[PDB]
Amino acid sequence: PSQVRQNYHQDAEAAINRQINLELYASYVYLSMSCYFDRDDVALKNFAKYFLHQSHEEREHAEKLMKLQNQRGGRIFLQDIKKPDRDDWESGLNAMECALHLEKSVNQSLLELHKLATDKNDPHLCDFIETYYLSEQVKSIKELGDHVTNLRKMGAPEAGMAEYLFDKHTLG
Amino acid sequence: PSQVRQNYHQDAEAAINRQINLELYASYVYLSMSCYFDRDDVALKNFAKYFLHQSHEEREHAEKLMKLQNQRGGRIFLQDIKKPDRDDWESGLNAMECALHLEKSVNQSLLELHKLATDKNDPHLCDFIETYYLSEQVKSIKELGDHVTNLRKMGAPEAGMAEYLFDKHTLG
Amino acid sequence: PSQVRQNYHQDAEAAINRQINLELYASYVYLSMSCYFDRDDVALKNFAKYFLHQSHEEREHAEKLMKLQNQRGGRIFLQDIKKPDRDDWESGLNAMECALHLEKSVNQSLLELHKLATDKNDPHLCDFIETYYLSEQVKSIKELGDHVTNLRKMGAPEAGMAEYLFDKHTLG
Amino acid sequence: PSQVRQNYHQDAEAAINRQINLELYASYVYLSMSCYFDRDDVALKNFAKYFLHQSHEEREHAEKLMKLQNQRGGRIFLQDIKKPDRDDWESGLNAMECALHLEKSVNQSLLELHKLATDKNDPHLCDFIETYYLSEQVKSIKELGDHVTNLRKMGAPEAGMAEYLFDKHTLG
Numbered sequence: 285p286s287q288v289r290q291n292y293h294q295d296a297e298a299a300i301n302r303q304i305n306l307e308l309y310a311s312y313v314y315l316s317m318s319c320y321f322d323r324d325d326v327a328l329k330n331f332a333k334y335f336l337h338q339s340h341e342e343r344e345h346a347e348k349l350m351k352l353q354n355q356r357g358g359r360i361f362l363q364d365i366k367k368p369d370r371d372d373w374e375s376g377l378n379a380m381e382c383a384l385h386l387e388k389s390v391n392q393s394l395l396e397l398h399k400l401a402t403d404k405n406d407p408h409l410c411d412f413i414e415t416y417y418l419s420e421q422v423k424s425i426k427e428l429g430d431h432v433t434n435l436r437k438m439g440a441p442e443a444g445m446a447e448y449l450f451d452k453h454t455l456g
Numbered sequence: 457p458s459q460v461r462q463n464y465h466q467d468a469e470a471a472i473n474r475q476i477n478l479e480l481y482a483s484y485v486y487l488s489m490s491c492y493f494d495r496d497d498v499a500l501k502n503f504a505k506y507f508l509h510q511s512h513e514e515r516e517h518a519e520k521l522m523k524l525q526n527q528r529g530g531r532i533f534l535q536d537i538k539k540p541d542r543d544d545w546e547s548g549l550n551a552m553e554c555a556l557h558l559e560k561s562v563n564q565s566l567l568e569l570h571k572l573a574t575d576k577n578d579p580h581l582c583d584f585i586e587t588y589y590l591s592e593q594v595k596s597i598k599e600l601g602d603h604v605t606n607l608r609k610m611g612a613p614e615a616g617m618a619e620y621l622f623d624k625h626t627l628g
Numbered sequence: 629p630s631q632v633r634q635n636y637h638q639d640a641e642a643a644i645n646r647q648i649n650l651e652l653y654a655s656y657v658y659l660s661m662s663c664y665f666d667r668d669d670v671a672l673k674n675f676a677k678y679f680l681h682q683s684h685e686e687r688e689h690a691e692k693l694m695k696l697q698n699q700r701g702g703r704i705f706l707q708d709i710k711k712p713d714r715d716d717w718e719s720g721l722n723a724m725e726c727a728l729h730l731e732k733s734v735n736q737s738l739l740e741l742h743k744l745a746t747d748k749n750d751p752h753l754c755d756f757i758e759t760y761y762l763s764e765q766v767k768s769i770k771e772l773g774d775h776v777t778n779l780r781k782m783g784a785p786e787a788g789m790a791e792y793l794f795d796k797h798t799l800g
Numbered sequence: 801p802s803q804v805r806q807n808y809h810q811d812a813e814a815a816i817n818r819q820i821n822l823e824l825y826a827s828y829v830y831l832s833m834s835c836y837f838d839r840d841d842v843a844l845k846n847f848a849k850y851f852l853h854q855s856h857e858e859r860e861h862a863e864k865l866m867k868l869q870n871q872r873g874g875r876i877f878l879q880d881i882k883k884p885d886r887d888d889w890e891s892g893l894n895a896m897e898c899a900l901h902l903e904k905s906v907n908q909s910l911l912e913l914h915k916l917a918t919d920k921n922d923p924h925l926c927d928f929i930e931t932y933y934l935s936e937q938v939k940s941i942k943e944l945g946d947h948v949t950n951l952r953k954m955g956a957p958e959a960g961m962a963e964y965l966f967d968k969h970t971l972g
Contacts, residue, residue, distance in 0.1 A: 384631065384632075388634055391634055391635075392634065392635075395635055395749075395751065398751045399749060402749075402751075410751070413751070414751050414752070414754075414755035415755070418751055418752045418755060419752065419755065419756070422699065422700065422752055423699070425632045425634065426496060426632050426698075426699045426701075428632075429496040429497075429499075429630070429631045429632035429701075430496060430499035431499075432631065433496060433497050433498065433499040433631075434499050434620060437499075437616040437619070437620065438616045438617050438620055439616050439617070443616075443617070445617065446616075446617065449617070449620070449621070453620075453624045458668055458669065458945070459668060459669070459900065459945045459948065459949075460668045460900075460941045460942050460944075460945035462904055462907055462908070462941065463907075463908075463911055480709075484706070484709065487691075487694075487706075488704075488706055491694050491698065491704045491706075492704075494694075494695065494698045495698055495703075496630055496631060496632045496698065496701055497630065497631070508691075515687075519659075519680075522659075522663050522666075523666065526663065526666045526667055526668065526942075527938060527939070527942045528938065529668060529945075531667075531715070532660075532663045532664075532715070533715055534656070534659075534660055534663075534711050534712060534715065535711055536708050536709065536710055536711050537652075537656065537708065537709035537711075538708055539706050539707055539708050539709075540706060543703075543704070543705055543706065577911075577915060577918075579911065579914045579918075579926070579929070579930050579934055580930070580934045580935065580938055582930075583930035583931070583934060583935065584935070668942060668945040668946060668949060669945075669949050670949065671945075671946035671947075671949040671950050671953075788953040788954045788955050788959075788962075789954050789955070789959070789961065789962065789965070791953070792950060792953065792954055792965070792969075793965070796969045
């Protein structure tokens, strides 16, 4: 085993690798959303900027997870990054709802990772997950819920003014 | 009696304590409004900021009243701060109308306090009420009336764009 | 349920509301202490400043708790803020001892909240309580214990010089 | 009559002259207190500084009253400035108590002046008295009451340390 490895279960290492892949997949999904909103028939600059920034933060989360895995003496094993479920997101509101669903799924995987670290008596992994991944995820979920609520209130996507004004005011 | 007490009726002291409680209750009501507008299914950041600022100003008014009561030689007696009448305010326009009603009620209590100080021949208390409480209250009433008029003109709350644009432009 | 609510028990939401009310009550108690120490027959400026600052920090704690409740998808329900047990605190030392007792009670409620979040498997709520409410409370308890020890050592309240010199040196 | 005189009763002018004399007498009393505390067998530098500053503020109040009398078209008639009741004030606490009594007497004369201006329907004189003479007087009364309370609590004048430490800390 690794010379630095201490109180690190193999199940926790496998779960960390799975979470790395999930964060990379979320980054890919946000990249797809930004590419959709950069289209000429969509033309929402701040929506694309928002989703590109989200993609970069998901990549940063995956990088920090790989740094944690190396720093605990684990071994990083990378899998295929699956393509996003769709290439056309049909709306700003629909993309925000899909991003909310993805964020909740990532949060659920983080919760199961914290539970697995708890039952394995891994206080460092639990503290890492709580400090760097749980609060940020809950903040992102709240922000996406606020965006979805505002976009539904304005009347998106049937009201054409709604997505434009949300792009100008909230995301700009 | 207090060594500093001079030309301070007991009725005026009791009315000052009642006004302290009323200002604290108004602060609690504004806190409730801000909490409502911070919800995920409401999501009006500047509405919540406005009502939180109003809560802090109401608390400051209560603190100034308690400072006046101590500075005149009276004794502060604190009562229970009653909970606000409702927890769900249903709209930005409805919350503005309720805040206008609360501001008018506080203004009316201040007017009766000034009348009681006048009939007791208390020029210092009258000057204190006029300088620090009456003009600010009338300004707040005018501002809330302007907000209510604008929100009704825009078509709140049936028009979803109206509350969002008022949040962005007037309160932002 | 809320669109952002995930891994948030109803028992935890009710306990958060109860803790909100307890923090508001503690703020009211500290306000009462500051009002007592601003009296003409007491005249301890730095004691009043200390207790007013404590009241403001308790209000800030309650505001952070309501922000957490909204940010987790819970619903804030406000109760009556009960009046403090007494209006005359009789001494600086007695007020410090009562503040220590109140701080220990708030700490105990926070401990039960953390236990309830632990048995409900709520790592985000546990991390929130540990990061923002436990360490600060233990620091406040230690500071109040130090103040009480110093005031008893100097001979408060029978020694009139003791409370004055503590007001000038420690709290000033 | 004066070319600028308008809505200025002769009773109000006489009361203003009497108040001018009373403020000058208060300035003389504070000068006497400062001279007492500059003595070699008393030796309280900050007590003397406090009472000299009070004398200068009383002179400023008398000058403002004379400016008001000239500005309303009245005529200033100066009387003899009576000597203070005593030259030996025996203590810092006793001097603070005598200053409190003098401040309350000046406040009472100001209250009767405001009542006379009210019954004569003189809103400018009432506003002048309220703005420049009532609030400052109540603040001075509260400050002197706080000083007296602190000095009695410390054990002045039997405790020799008390007046020295009050001179160093509160007045310094």
